Design a protein around this ligand. Structure first.
Ligand SMILES: O[C@@H]1[C@@H](O)[C@@H](O)OC[C@H]1O
Ligand SMILES: O[C@@H]1[C@@H](O)[C@@H](O)OC[C@H]1O
Lengths: 380, 380
């Protein structure tokens, strides 16, 4: 008779992708265990028989400090072991996350490293934790790392904040890889580069930390990111809380979960390019190839004569401008198949192809499957 | 030179799955068009050069009424054409949504229909719209439909609300299919059935309308749902706003997008069962088969002698209790492969299998692929 029910309270934020992942793991546990739990996503802030909560929040910790019922905290890791709150704790491995992104940029020949973080001013201790890790694994590189804490998440002066970020960005030499604390901060870099037409990744490379597509700002350049092991975190949390509900004795748990993987998108697609003019020209093309652009537009974007730009393209890419314009139409098309929900007809049309048959033809030449086949094998 | 930038303001709610889908479509458009837009998810509530907003919100409509810049409203459809707000409008087809769920239950022999809605008290006009549709397509069924508006989303008295929902549920004859306005309301039905041990779907069938897994309450019985065409909605919205930004003349658009599909889960998995004792016994099994239960527990759950229950199981299922216990261990396992992120090892263990090899063996007998193969071909 499975009659005893437990009310379970989850203190997270439905509006942030990471929080949503954690709760989904909790839900996964519910499914796998078929527990007689009544789980409430109760966060705004009665309390149940067990709690799982966001402990990246000092307020929550203070609210919960002295609560009798089992609590499993979920939040960021800490280099110092005595900085962990007095509760069982599932942790995202802050070090590993930065490491994961560092190793990604490392593999792409990048040896100039930059970090866009978050002021001490915010209460974000995982930010400090990530910055420290950055410094730790950047220590032995050819050129030194450079760190720039921001102004604040919701600036008291957006315009001013933008100016300061713009200033810092123009400071950074070509082929600098930037690690942002959060996809949100990464997108902040991308919008400024948009304002300024700074080539990403042709000039500077950008990588984030959440794998969240919905941040304050949406970015035309798709954002590479470290995906946290957030589902697994929520699952392990519930699994532990279950043992805590069976009155099991235990020293306070500190289990670290590493990132799942890096999702490689456009923003880190660096191909060893170095000539400033090809850099700006290649960026231009990667923005507007689908819009049916001629070599003339590319020439006008940089301020260069046809002869000279062709010479340099040949020099650095072994292909023509015209050829690269069209190779990129394909790339846009290939991405959308992979990262989007559009019909193939829509992809063809939005990518400036004359007919869906023509795209089919061109696509089947470059890769060997069909647009359709390639989608099933490679989607998301 | 693609130098003119447009600031775009989106007025939606990051915390609700439907809103998040809509914004993702907007993002899809950004990708496919590589527009020089600066898109802000600005909703709490400066304004940009174009707006896309949740027009299921009378406050937003009033806030925006008299704004000079292009606006594309997104929200629910209306049976009456004069109830649409004075703006270009992308609509989810409220009728089609109910229809989609109705047709799903219809296909499963269901001919007793119920609707859990939302009081007039809330400002939710899509709720009224869905209820009306329900009534419209339930008109010709054998038994009449029954509608129950709730107490309110965040009750002024949770306990009281639960009592009233419990009352209504015990009113409903076996093999009643319930359509809820929203996965949220559906889950409210499921938690009460949990409190009361009312078999779903063995006794009553439940289907929702959003395909959202994260609602106020998490449900042990996975929830079947209609998935709205919400991405496409957001994409079409941005695509229209783009034409509006190119100063194109147009009569106020009213384009309806139908649901994508119905996601069939446990909550609508009705297999023509009718004997009350098998109903309760089968529900029991579907909850605890993985927990290593004997025939004795099933006997105790209903209040029936072994002989009699076996007789009835044979009569309605052509299988033994013992046999069905084990067929369901497999089903739990098969689901988790399909709907979850767990490792196969974890699935085996949580489903009460003695070894991963044994599960492999049993799984390969029932279906012909391996747990691994079946995951790649059938996941999500
Ligand atoms: O690590 C997370 C960070 O990346 C951001 O998403 O905000 C919540 C944090 O816990
Ligand atoms: O149709 C949607 C409904 O299902 C719910 O999710 O709330 C928002 C509505 O627009």
């Amino acid at each position: 008779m499975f009659t005893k029910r437990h009310r379970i309270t989850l203190l997270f934020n439905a509006n942030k992708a990471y929080d949503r992942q954690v709760v989904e793991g909790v839900g996964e546990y519910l499914q796998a265990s078929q527990s007689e739990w009544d789980i409430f996503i109760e966060e705004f802030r009665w309390l149940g028989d067990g709690v799982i909560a966001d402990f990246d929040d000092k307020q929550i910790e203070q609210a919960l400090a002295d609560v009798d019922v089992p609590i499993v905290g979920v939040g960021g890791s800490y280099h110092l072991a005595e900085s962990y709150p007095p509760v069982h704790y599932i942790a995202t491995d802050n070090y590993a996350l930065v490491e994961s992104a560092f190793l990604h940029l490392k593999e792409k020949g990048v040896n100039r490293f930059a970090f866009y973080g978050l002021p001490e001013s915010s209460g974000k201790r995982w930010a400090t934790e990530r910055e420290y890790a950055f410094r730790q694994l950047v220590a032995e590189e050819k050129y030194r790392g450079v760190v720039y804490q921001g102004l604040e998440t919701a600036p008291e002066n957006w315009q001013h904040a933008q100016n300061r970020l713009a200033d810092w960005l123009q400071t950074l030499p070509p082929q600098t890889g930037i690690i942002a604390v959060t996809d949100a901060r990464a997108r902040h870099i991308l919008q400024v580069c948009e304002h300024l037409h700074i080539p990403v990744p042709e000039k500077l490379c950008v990588i984030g930390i959440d794998n969240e597509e919905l941040t304050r700002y949406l970015s035309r350049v798709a954002l590479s990111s470290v995906a946290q092991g957030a589902r697994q975190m929520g699952y392990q949390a519930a699994k532990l809380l279950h043992r805590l509900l069976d009155k099991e004795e235990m020293p306070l748990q500190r289990i670290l979960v590493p990132p799942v993987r890096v999702i490689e998108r456009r923003s880190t697609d660096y191909r060893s390019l170095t000539d400033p003019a090809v850099i700006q020209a290649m960026h231009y093309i990667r923005n507007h190839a689908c819009k049916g652009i001629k070599v003339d537009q590319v020439l006008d974007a940089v301020g260069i004569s046809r002869s000279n730009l062709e010479k340099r393209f040949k020099e650095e890419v072994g292909e023509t401008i015209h050829a690269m314009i069209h190779a990129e139409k394909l790339e846009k098309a290939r991405s959308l198949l992979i990262s989007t929900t559009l019909s193939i007809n829509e992809i063809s049309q939005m990518c400036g192809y004359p007919s869906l048959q023509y795209f089919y033809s061109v696509f089947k030449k470059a890769y060997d499957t069909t647009p359709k086949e390639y989608r099933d094998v490679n989607s998301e």
